[model samples]
Target chain A: APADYFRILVQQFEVQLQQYRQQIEELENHLATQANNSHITPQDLSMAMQKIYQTFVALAAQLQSIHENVKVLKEQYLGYRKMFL
Target chain B: APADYFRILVQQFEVQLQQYRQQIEELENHLATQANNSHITPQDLSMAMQKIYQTFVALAAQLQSIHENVKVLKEQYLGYRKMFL
Candidate 1:
């Protein structure tokens, strides 16, 4: 009776998680390219790495915040769906 | 008569500048500890140094902006304070 996704809430979260995982993988690939480039000096390489790390820290915070928001939305979705069906 | 403390404004700004210097020192200390650990790869150490330099550049910009502001404030403070007291 609970909507089709009190059962699927976990699935939705996993789907979003998978998308983020793919994005992270892509960023790592870019970083690896920059890391391997011979034209860049060690200092440049280091700065690039630090910037990437900082970007990741910021992204992780945003994703974690979104995950919590999604959790709340799923709870509400399930609650409302339960009432109607 | 035009408030007793116009003369003290420069002193106050200097005090604030000193406080910010102390904060920058503390941040440097924490960065130093992370930099010294042998476990960090050369790449990691380079990244750490780069970020520290970035932090310095940011701090310098902030201090420069504040100094400009103080210069303007000093002009006004001296003008008004000289006229009345």
Candidate 2:
């Protein structure tokens, strides 16, 4: 049922956004720190980038899951449309 | 309106994924190079991180837009349910 699937999806997507917001906030903090400082430390910059890479990898997996789930949902929606409309 | 919103959403999401996919691919390329070799180049590591930061900013905006759009979609669903369910 669309209602059933959608209820779960709403919670899942909200949680996903919350996680993304926190991760992005930390990256922004690091970037802001780098911006205000001497900007001469390869060490700090590398560390920041390393964190960014961590997010990239995490989000990559996340996106794959979303893409797969969204495809399934679209199929479900299309089926509903065909049968009901 | 849900159909209208969802149609545009499908296309927008596909485009966003396309953009994200390419950026991630490059990040992986850079990281793979760093991982397989001596990994001694601050210049290269710094460059990789720099690129990662760029991607971070780009995706930050992308995520904000997605978050906003999803919220709007959820509101639509709420209204739909209130009326129909």
TM-score of each: 0.29, 0.41
Docking class of 2: incorrect
RMSD of each: 18.0, 23.1
DockQ, all candidates in order: 0.02, 0.02
Off by over 4 Å in 2: A1-85, B27-40
Colliding pairs, model 1? A5-A8
CAPRI quality level assigned to candidate 1 from its DockQ score: incorrect
Candidate 1 C-alpha lDDT tens digits along A1-85:
2333322433343344345334545544554565466322334333433543564465346545545654666678789999999
Cα displacement (angstroms), candidate 1, residue A78, comes to 63
- Candidate 1 recovers a fraction of native contacts equal to 0.00
Q: What is each predicted model's overall lDDT from 0 to 1? A: 0.46, 0.56
Tens digit per residue, CA lDDT, model 2, B1-85: 6556645644454455457546656555555565467332324433544564577678557655655776677787798899997
